[PDB]
C-alpha cells in the first residue's frame, strides 16, 4: 500500500487503493510527470491506473 507520491515510495493518504501515472497536464519546469495515488483512479490514455505497491516506478 504505497507508491511514488513525493518522488519517494511512500504511503499516500485519502485512503488510496490505486496509483496513477498522469502524464497529461502540459506544464513546463517538469518532464510531464504527475504521479499520485487515489481511491478511485480513472484509467485513461493520459492518466493510467495501477493496483500494486511501487507500480508507478
UniProtKB/Swiss-Prot annotation:
<feature type="disulfide bond">
    <location>
        <begin position="50"/>
        <end position="55"/>
    </location>
</feature>
<keyword id="KW-0800">Toxin</keyword>
<feature type="disulfide bond">
    <location>
        <begin position="3"/>
        <end position="19"/>
    </location>
</feature>
<comment type="similarity">
    <text>Belongs to the three-finger toxin family. Short-chain subfamily. Mambalgin sub-subfamily.</text>
</comment>
<keyword id="KW-0872">Ion channel impairing toxin</keyword>
<keyword id="KW-1015">Disulfide bond</keyword>
<feature type="site" description="Important residue for inhibition of rat ASIC1a">
    <location>
        <position position="27"/>
    </location>
</feature>
<feature type="disulfide bond">
    <location>
        <begin position="12"/>
        <end position="37"/>
    </location>
</feature>
<keyword id="KW-0964">Secreted</keyword>
<feature type="site" description="Key residue for inhibition of rat ASIC1a, probably binds to rat ASIC1a F-350">
    <location>
        <position position="32"/>
    </location>
</feature>
<keyword id="KW-0732">Signal</keyword>
<dbReference type="GO" id="GO:0005576">
    <property type="term" value="C:extracellular region"/>
</dbReference>
<keyword id="KW-0582">Pharmaceutical</keyword>
<feature type="site" description="Important residue for inhibition of rat ASIC1a">
    <location>
        <position position="34"/>
    </location>
</feature>
<keyword id="KW-1275">Proton-gated sodium channel impairing toxin</keyword>
<dbReference type="GO" id="GO:0099106">
    <property type="term" value="F:ion channel regulator activity"/>
</dbReference>
<feature type="site" description="Important residue for inhibition of rat ASIC1a">
    <location>
        <position position="33"/>
    </location>
</feature>
<feature type="disulfide bond">
    <location>
        <begin position="41"/>
        <end position="49"/>
    </location>
</feature>
<protein>
    <recommendedName>
        <fullName>Mambalgin-1</fullName>
    </recommendedName>
</protein>
<dbReference type="GO" id="GO:0090729">
    <property type="term" value="F:toxin activity"/>
</dbReference>
<feature type="site" description="Important residue for inhibition of rat ASIC1a">
    <location>
        <position position="28"/>
    </location>
</feature>
<comment type="function">
    <text>This three-finger toxin inhibits ASIC channels. It acts as a gating modifier toxin by decreasing the apparent proton sensitivity of activation and by slightly increasing the apparent proton sensitivity for inactivation. It binds more tightly to the closed state and to a much lesser extent the inactivated/desensitized state of ASIC1a isoform of ASIC1. It interacts directly with the outside surface of the thumb domain of chicken ASIC1a (ASIC1a), but does not insert into the acidic pocket as suggested for mambalgin-2.</text>
</comment>
Amino acid at each position: 500500500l504505497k507508491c511514488y507520491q513525493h518522488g519517494k515510495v511512500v504511503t499516500c493518504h485519502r485512503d488510496m487503493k490505486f496509483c496513477y501515472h498522469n502524464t497529461g497536464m502540459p506544464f513546463r519546469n517538469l518532464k510531464l510527470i504527475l504521479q499520485g495515488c487515489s481511491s478511485s483512479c480513472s484509467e485513461t490514455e493520459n492518466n493510467k491506473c495501477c493496483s500494486t505497491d511501487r507500480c508507478n516506478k
